[PDB]
Structure 1
Amino acid sequence: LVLPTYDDVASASERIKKFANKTPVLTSSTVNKEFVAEVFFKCENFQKMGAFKFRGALNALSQLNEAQRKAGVLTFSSGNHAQAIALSAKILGIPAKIIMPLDAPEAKVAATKGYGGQVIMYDRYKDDREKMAKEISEREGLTIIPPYDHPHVLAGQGTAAKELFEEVGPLDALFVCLGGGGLLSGSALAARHFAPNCEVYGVEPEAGNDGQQSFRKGSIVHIDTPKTIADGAQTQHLGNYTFSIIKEKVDDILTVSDEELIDCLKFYAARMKIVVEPTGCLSFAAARAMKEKLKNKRIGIIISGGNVDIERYAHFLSQ
């Protein structure tokens, strides 16, 4: 596999500049005092469509030629890449078919349809969504734009970390949410450019620690779909492109419980005044767990997204 490099992240910044949001970086006095450090939060929950995914989607679709754009694209996603592709596709006038899990947050499915995406569903725990994707794409002549295991997609996700480092400088540690590895691999490429000798940490829900196992083992570990409220991290295994990069440019993979995610979600709401979906709480939850190692350092936290069903969010806040 020909792996993308920081050069691809840099070019991605150019391709998305026209429509993507240069999301703000927030800080918290409470957090800094508790951690005895300087923590910076990159708010991708404020990105177009509510998650970092718009970056990878636009970067990928922008590189399709005229014929490919007219023919249409297909993708499979837990929900955010789905919305990202739908929005990017609308902007570029590209027809888009999207395969989503039946138990995906209603808000993510609704938004995808609202953007003009044609949605087909699958069972997250029993079906092989990639098998479905291949067949539908092969049968309808559609270009598949994977949710993470693709050079253009992962390179694009890396622009969030790129922007963070350009705004606050190199950081001793960067915490990143981990599902298939697109956000983490892209972030790692940017991290090694701006802070080659610092730390990059991926974080998965404990029930879905396939990435952590792969990292320790040296090969991709496959697990049954994990049951966790982190709906954007229920992947069965890491992508091939992403793992290739993660294995080389990531220092460690951590895990946190759903209980910890909920406490983090409440903290974000009560102390930082921002809405973050469970999956977007992985990074901060892990940072809190290892705060002792972060004393007197500068830390970067990626808030990956904020797309949740309000009713469910209200439920979490009530725990």
Structure 2
Amino acid sequence: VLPTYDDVASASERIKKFANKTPVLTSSTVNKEFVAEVFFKCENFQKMGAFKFRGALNALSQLNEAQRKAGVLTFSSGNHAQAIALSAKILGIPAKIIMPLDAPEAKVAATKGYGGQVIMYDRYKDDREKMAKEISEREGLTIIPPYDHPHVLAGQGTAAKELFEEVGPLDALFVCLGGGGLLSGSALAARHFAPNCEVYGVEPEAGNDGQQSFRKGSIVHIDTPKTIADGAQTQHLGNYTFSIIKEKVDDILTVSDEELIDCLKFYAARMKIVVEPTGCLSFAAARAMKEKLKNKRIGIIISGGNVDIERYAHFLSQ
């Protein structure tokens, strides 16, 4: 049932033709403050702006003939929707995207630019799931989970795979945590390339269901948390993702929005890169324990840079 590093390896092969082997950035400013060597895997530079492109492409690249012709459908309010839309376009698969009537104009335009057929719903009614079921069952459309899927998580893991192949062994790896696709895929990669590398997942303190699950040994559900980390407002971990996280992740950490904001500002002012709030979870945690990272080689996964410009300007002004 559970994917292994071999699936991450095969995913690298499947996506090689379309995915970006994103650059790894370093900062003399960061290295100084940490008294270590930090390596940033920039998935904000990934096709469509987030790491999710990897898992979306890996999953769509394996649908059967009937599904390819019928098409796919998404209703997620996060990066998965655009990851699926772009992946579908690249693979010649029709894609319908359910979005709120008040969705950011730039996001709607981007989705249409990805060939996605936009279907809107009223945000106040929040009829998303109902609509997704009705449309998908009637039209034979396939819905790919944003994280709880073997193909999706294996694909997300290729970012870490690339990081290790480029910089070599790492003593610590920090990864953003929502549903757990990125973390589980990254853990598979880390355990293979660096058995002794400490792997950490990071959640917003207001939504530490992943942390609670890790402690309890069972998946814990919570009400949608209020936090600026819009991509980590997950209510619970996935079955596949948690099964791997529980076995291959060393610990789950949490950071405050205040910390996410300082990190977002730092990325902009010191490293000159645009990172969405949720994509700051990993570095914020690392900074929070820079004292325990002495002279180690540390990997930071920058998950994405898809933040509404107005919102970005807002946080930068905080």
- Name the TM-score, length of structure 2 as normaliser: 0.95
Contact 1:73–1:96 (CA under 8 A) maintained in structure 2: yes
Structure 1 pair 102–43 and aligned structure 2 pair: CA distance change class (3 A):
farther
Q: By how many angstroms is 1:77 displaced?
A: 2.0
Distance, in Å, in 2 between the alignment partners of 1:211 and 1:298 is 26
- Note the alpha carbon deviations across 1:153-181, whole angstroms, 9 max, x for none: 11000000000000011111100001110
- Note the alpha carbon deviations across 1:124-152, whole angstroms, 9 max, x for none: 89858556544432232111111111100
- Note the alpha carbon deviations across 1:87-139, whole angstroms, 9 max, x for none: 11111111112234667655334322321223345688985855654443223
Structure 1 pair 121–148 and aligned structure 2 pair: CA distance change class (3 A):
farther
Q: Percent identity at matched positions?
A: 100
Q: Which runs of 5+ in 2 are unaligned?
A: none
Structure 1 pair 102–56 and aligned structure 2 pair: CA distance change class (3 A):
farther
> Which 10-residue stretch deviates more, 128-137 or 216-225?
128-137
> Which 10-residue stretch deviates more, 104-113 or 61-70?
104-113
- In structure 2, the residue matched to 1:89 is 88
Say which SS state the counterpart of residue 45 (structure 1) adopts: helix
Say which SS state the counterpart of residue 237 (structure 1) adopts: coil
- Note the alpha carbon deviations across 1:231-283, whole angstroms, 9 max, x for none: 11111111111111111111111111111111000000011010000000000
Contact 2:67–2:140 (CA under 8 A) maintained in structure 1: no
> Which 10-residue stretch deviates more, 217-226 or 68-77?
68-77
Q: By how many angstroms is 1:309 displaced?
A: 1.3
Structure 1 pair 185–108 and aligned structure 2 pair: CA distance change class (3 A):
farther
Contact 2:282–2:302 (CA under 8 A) maintained in structure 1: yes
Q: CA RMSD in A?
A: 1.8
Structure 1 pair 303–8 and aligned structure 2 pair: CA distance change class (3 A):
same
- Note the alpha carbon deviations across 1:27-58, whole angstroms, 9 max, x for none: 00010010000000000000101110110111
Distance, in Å, in 2 between the alignment partners of 1:210 and 1:15 is 32
Contact 1:104–1:231 (CA under 8 A) maintained in structure 2: no
Structure 1 pair 198–24 and aligned structure 2 pair: CA distance change class (3 A):
same
Contact 1:125–1:225 (CA under 8 A) maintained in structure 2: no
Say which SS state the counterpart of residue 202 (structure 2) adopts: strand
Count, aligned residues: 318
- In structure 2, the residue matched to 1:255 is 254
Contact 1:149–1:239 (CA under 8 A) maintained in structure 2: yes
- Name the TM-score, length of structure 1 as normaliser: 0.94
> Which 10-residue stretch deviates more, 146-155 or 58-67?
58-67
Contact 1:280–1:306 (CA under 8 A) maintained in structure 2: yes
Structure 1 pair 107–246 and aligned structure 2 pair: CA distance change class (3 A):
farther
Q: By how many angstroms is 1:196 displaced?
A: 1.5
Contact 1:204–1:282 (CA under 8 A) maintained in structure 2: yes
Structure 1 pair 134–241 and aligned structure 2 pair: CA distance change class (3 A):
farther
